[PDB]
Amino acid sequence: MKKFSVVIAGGGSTFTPGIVLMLLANQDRFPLRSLKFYDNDGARQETIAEACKVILKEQAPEIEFSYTTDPQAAFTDVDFVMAHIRVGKYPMREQDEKIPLRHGVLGQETCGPGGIAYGMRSIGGVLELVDYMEKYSPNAWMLNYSNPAAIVAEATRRLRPNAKILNICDMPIGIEGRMAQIVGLKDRKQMRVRYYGLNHFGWWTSIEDLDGNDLMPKLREYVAKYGYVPPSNDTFAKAKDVQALDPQTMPNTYLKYYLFPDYVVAHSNPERTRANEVMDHREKNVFSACRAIIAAGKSTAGDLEIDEHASYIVDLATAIAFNTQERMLLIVPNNGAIHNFDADAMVEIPCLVGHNGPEPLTVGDIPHFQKGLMSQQVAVEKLVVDAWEQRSYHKLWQAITLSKTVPSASVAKAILDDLIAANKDYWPELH
Amino acid sequence: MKKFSVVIAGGGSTFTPGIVLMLLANQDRFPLRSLKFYDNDGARQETIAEACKVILKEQAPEIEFSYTTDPQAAFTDVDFVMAHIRVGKYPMREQDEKIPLRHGVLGQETCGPGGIAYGMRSIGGVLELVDYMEKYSPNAWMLNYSNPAAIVAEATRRLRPNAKILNICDMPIGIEGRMAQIVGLKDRKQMRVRYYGLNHFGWWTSIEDLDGNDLMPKLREYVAKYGYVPPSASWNDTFAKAKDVQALDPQTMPNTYLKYYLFPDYVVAHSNPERTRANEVMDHREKNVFSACRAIIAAGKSTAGDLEIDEHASYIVDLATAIAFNTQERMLLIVPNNGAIHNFDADAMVEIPCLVGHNGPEPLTVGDIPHFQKGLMSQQVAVEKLVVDAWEQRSYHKLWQAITLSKTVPSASVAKAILDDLIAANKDYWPELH
Ligand SMILES: NC(=O)c1ccc[n+]([C@@H]2O[C@H](COP(=O)([O-])OP(=O)(O)OC[C@H]3O[C@@H](n4cnc5c(N)ncnc54)[C@H](O)[C@@H]3O)[C@@H](O)[C@H]2O)c1
Ligand SMILES: NC(=O)c1ccc[n+]([C@@H]2O[C@H](COP(=O)([O-])OP(=O)(O)OC[C@H]3O[C@@H](n4cnc5c(N)ncnc54)[C@H](O)[C@@H]3O)[C@@H](O)[C@H]2O)c1
Ligand SMILES: [Cl-]
Ligand SMILES: [Cl-]
Ligand SMILES: [Cl-]
Ligand SMILES: [Cl-]
Ligand SMILES: [Cl-]
Numbered sequence: 115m116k117k118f119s120v121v122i123a124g125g126g127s128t129f130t131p132g133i134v135l136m137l138l139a140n141q142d143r144f145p146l147r148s149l150k151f152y153d154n155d156g157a158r159q160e161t162i163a164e165a166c167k168v169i170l171k172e173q174a175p176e177i178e179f180s181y182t183t184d185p186q187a188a189f190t191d192v193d194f195v196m197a198h199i200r201v202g203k204y205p206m207r208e209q210d211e212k213i214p215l216r217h218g219v220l221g222q223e224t225c226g227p228g229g230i231a232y233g234m235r236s237i238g239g240v241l242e243l244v245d246y247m248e249k250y251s252p253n254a255w256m257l258n259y260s261n262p263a264a265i266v267a268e269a270t271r272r273l274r275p276n277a278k279i280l281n282i283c284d285m286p287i288g289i290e291g292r293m294a295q296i297v298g299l300k301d302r303k304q305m306r307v308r309y310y311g312l313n314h315f316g317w318w319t320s321i322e323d324l325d326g327n328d329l330m331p332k333l334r335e336y337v338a339k340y341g342y343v344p345p346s347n348d349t350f351a352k353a354k355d356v357q358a359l360d361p362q363t364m365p366n367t368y369l370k371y372y373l374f375p376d377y378v379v380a381h382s383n384p385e386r387t388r389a390n391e392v393m394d395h396r397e398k399n400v401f402s403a404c405r406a407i408i409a410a411g412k413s414t415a416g417d418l419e420i421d422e423h424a425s426y427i428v429d430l431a432t433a434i435a436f437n438t439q440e441r442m443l444l445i446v447p448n449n450g451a452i453h454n455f456d457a458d459a460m461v462e463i464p465c466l467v468g469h470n471g472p473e474p475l476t477v478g479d480i481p482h483f484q485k486g487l488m489s490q491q492v493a494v495e496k497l498v499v500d501a502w503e504q505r506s507y508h509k510l511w512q513a514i515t516l517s518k519t520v521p522s523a524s525v526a527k528a529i530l531d532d533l534i535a536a537n538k539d540y541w542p543e544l545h
Numbered sequence: 546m547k548k549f550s551v552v553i554a555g556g557g558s559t560f561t562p563g564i565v566l567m568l569l570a571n572q573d574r575f576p577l578r579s580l581k582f583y584d585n586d587g588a589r590q591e592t593i594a595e596a597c598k599v600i601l602k603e604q605a606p607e608i609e610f611s612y613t614t615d616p617q618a619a620f621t622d623v624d625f626v627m628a629h630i631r632v633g634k635y636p637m638r639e640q641d642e643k644i645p646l647r648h649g650v651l652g653q654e655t656c657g658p659g660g661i662a663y664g665m666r667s668i669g670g671v672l673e674l675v676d677y678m679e680k681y682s683p684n685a686w687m688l689n690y691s692n693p694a695a696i697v698a699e700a701t702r703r704l705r706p707n708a709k710i711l712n713i714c715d716m717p718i719g720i721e722g723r724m725a726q727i728v729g730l731k732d733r734k735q736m737r738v739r740y741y742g743l744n745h746f747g748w749w750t751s752i753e754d755l756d757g758n759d760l761m762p763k764l765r766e767y768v769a770k771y772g773y774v775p776p777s778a779s780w781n782d783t784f785a786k787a788k789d790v791q792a793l794d795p796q797t798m799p800n801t802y803l804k805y806y807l808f809p810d811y812v813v814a815h816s817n818p819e820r821t822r823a824n825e826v827m828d829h830r831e832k833n834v835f836s837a838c839r840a841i842i843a844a845g846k847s848t849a850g851d852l853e854i855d856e857h858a859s860y861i862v863d864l865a866t867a868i869a870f871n872t873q874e875r876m877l878l879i880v881p882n883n884g885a886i887h888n889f890d891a892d893a894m895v896e897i898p899c900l901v902g903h904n905g906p907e908p909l910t911v912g913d914i915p916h917f918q919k920g921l922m923s924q925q926v927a928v929e930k931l932v933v934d935a936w937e938q939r940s941y942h943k944l945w946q947a948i949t950l951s952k953t954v955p956s957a958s959v960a961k962a963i964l965d966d967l968i969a970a971n972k973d974y975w976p977e978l979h
Contacts, residue, residue, distance in 0.1 A: 475910065
């Protein structure tokens with residue numbers, strides 16, 4: 115019937131090609147009349163964009179394509195914005211990981227002080243995107259799968275409460291995929307689940323096949339021995355220890371950072387972090403492939419391939435486009451879904467997705483263990499956004515001090531000072 | 546593939562035959578190995594059951610059939626209980642309607658002091674059915690479409706919080722059916738809606754076709770001129786009157802029962818204290834169905850009675866099948882609020898959209914509701930909770946408070962006069978009130 119207009123914010127992402135490839139393999143369920151790229155780093159995006167221009171011309175030359183650094187040109191005439199930006203890129207991620215480690219605190223992209231720092235950089239970036247979208251395409255939907263979703267979602271809830279923004283996380287997708295393999299189902303869409311939490315901080319409470327057969331027993335018996343490692347890395351295996359605290363549920367893998375922070379630090383190397391691995395491998399590999407493709411005018415000159423994993427974004431996009439009522443986990447204002455939890459908290463819960471966005475299902479009352487953990491972590495997140503809004507040093511020191519990943523307020527302060535000096539070019543002045 | 550065992554509580558209901566004919570026409574989606582009727586009025590059930598037995602022998606002789614007044618015989622080996630009991634029957638309903646009218650207050654089956662009286666009689670009966678079910682078939686589900694659901698659901702929420710009871714109402718089904726004809730769709734299942742309220746006291750907030758097209762603009766235009774009367778005497782007046790009820794909040798569509806709360810003066814004005822709805826049903830439906838059943842028995846053939854399939858009732862099979870086959874079908878059910886309507890009492894029973902599967906309902910959130918509806922619902926839910934307070938605590942003042950608080954009642958003095966009459970008339974059903 116109709117073809118859609120999509121703009122990818124963060125066109126310079128090393129995941130942009132795989133995603134474009136995935137979109138092309140899904141023109142049957144989600145056809146496009148136009149595809150545009152947007153980035154604030156022109157030179158970086160150009161390499162990714164010229165390579166994709168070749169791919170698109172090969173598999174779908176009928177699709178109108180363009181890339182730019184100009185918001186008006188990028189956000190004009192679009193139905194959807196796919197946002198995957200990394201304010202500060204990998205050089206800043208390296209700082210997020212190493213600074214906490216100098217003080218004996220885990221350094222990670224979205225958890226602990228590292229995540230807090232990334233969130234402080236990301237809030238402004240994402241608010242700008244929202245403002246461009248509303249100005250040039252007031253009816254468009256933004257599919258934000260950027261990080262740290264918990265902090266950024268709190269900011270958009272607070273400062274852009276009526277903006278058509280959908281915050282989604284792919285971590286649960288990956289864990290459900292492994293759970294499916296473990297119990298022997300062909301994919302995660304063969305399961306129906308109940309879940310609650312914050313982004314990167316939740317639990318499955320009910321896991322059944324489509325017929326209603328309870329899969330929890332089978333998963334409990336297996337996960338207790340091997341974690342989320344299917345019969346076919348460390349994070350998935352460690353889920354074994356996370357799940358033992360509450361035998362009746364299945365935990366999100368990111369909970370290892372909050373329940374076993376001593377372990378993460380113990381297995382961390384302050385000299386080489388994950389950002390270093392990506393910069394040494396993925397960053398060069400993808401750009402080298404794009405350079406090769408441009409030089410040849412053929413995609414085959416590159417080893418890029420489809421990111422079937424990212425198909426959940428099309429699930430979301432199509433749910434809205436064709437009002438499918440598909441059931442999926444989204445980050446939404448709680449407002450009674452979890453009855454005994456803060457109404458103004460952003461929570462990750464099951465929702466039906468239609469053309470008007472999500473219809474969250476009720477969750478009910480949650481127990482003291484999860485409630486206590488979530489209350490602590492959402493306060494951290496809300497303090498980070500307080501610090502950004504109010505340009506308050508004490509609000510951020512409070513946030514860091516409150517984190518379960520941080521042993522004391524003195525260590526929290528030492529880290530905060532180091533973080534301030536490193537993020538001078540991104541954070542507002544803190545008083 | 547799997548066959549179900551059902552018992553109908555209220556076998557002597559004039560709706561039982563039409564419902565049985567409905568079950569028979571749906572053996573494809575809901576196969577039965579067994580069907581049983583239960584009633585506490587043997588002689589009345591016997592006429593209905595013996596007539597239905599002739600129908601089952603003609604259409605489904607494989608289905609095991611029996612009727613009884615024995616709870617053990619009735620509630621043993623069942624998967625579902627379909628409960629449609631009317632404690633006190635029509636003679637008591639006549640009292641519910643006429644006592645308030647004698648004092649210038651509307652008399653109605655489930656709304657106003659009549660509804661309150663019927664609820665006081667029903668709580669005990671339903672608590673008994675639930676206890677029998679749990680004792681003789683612990684794993685069975687009760688499909689309760691009896692009335693007055695708002696009072697009874699509040700009672701079971703407090704006193705049988707963990708029993709497997711699904712509270713459902715058929716009024717929204719009928720109104721949606723009419724809405725569909727009005728917009729021109731094939732049927733109500735071609736629409737997806739959002740709704741909130743108490744039983745017999747709610748509003749549709751969103752009405753779309755399955756593709757998401759807005760049907761509210763066309764409905765507003767039509768309803769503002771003719772109410773819910775489709776293009777195509779009692780109910781016909783109520784559907785037309787929705788015109789006036791809907792005008793208070795143009796952005797929504799109301800449940801027809803709201804006419805009793807927003808236009809109670811109108812209802813009293815168009816009421817006859819000497820002949821009420823109960824008298825109409827008694828002189829028509831009660832006579833006709835029993836005479837038809839009596840004709841089928843005497844002739845030994847279904848064609849001897851003018852019994853028609855109750856296609857409307859099919860919603861009961863939608864519910865039963867959703868549970869039995871984990872279909873995730875979306876429908877309105879009466880469930881504990883507990884945050885679904887965020888700015889409304891968590892312990893209130895609310896009528897809202899739910900997904901229904903084998904574990905029962907999964908309610909959808911509603912969000913915050915506006916002052917108008919919140920005000921009306923807070924008033925009415927307090928009435929309902931006061932009734933159950935009166936029942937539980939055996940308190941006269943609690944029921945006087947309940948009746949006084951009703952938007953159908955003008956004052957505490959009128960409320961007290963009505964209460965004293967209802968007490969005398971319900972001598973054999975109500976618990977004592979100190
Ligand atoms: N499937 C995916 O795309 C995927 C996978 C994992 C994580 N993520 C998350 O999505 C985000 C993107 O990470 P990545 O590794 O996919 O991309 P990346 O780190 O390879 O590149 C990020 C791009 O965003 C651009 N950018 C930064 N700030 C911007 C702004 N204000 N406006 C416009 N563009 C801006 C940068 O110039 C850069 O080209 C991260 O937060 C990450 O946690 C996405
Ligand atoms: N059956 C339907 O589809 C339908 C339609 C509209 C309304 N209702 C509602 O359902 C209820 C039944 O109404 P009706 O007109 O269908 O029935 P009815 O008045 O025709 O018959 C009611 C039956 O329930 C029996 N009964 C009363 N108390 C009982 C008890 N404690 N245990 C067992 N049986 C008992 C009576 O003896 C009688 O046989 C009412 O509350 C009514 O508002 C049902
Ligand atoms: Cl707030
Ligand atoms: Cl390599
Ligand atoms: Cl909605
Ligand atoms: Cl600021
Ligand atoms: Cl909807």
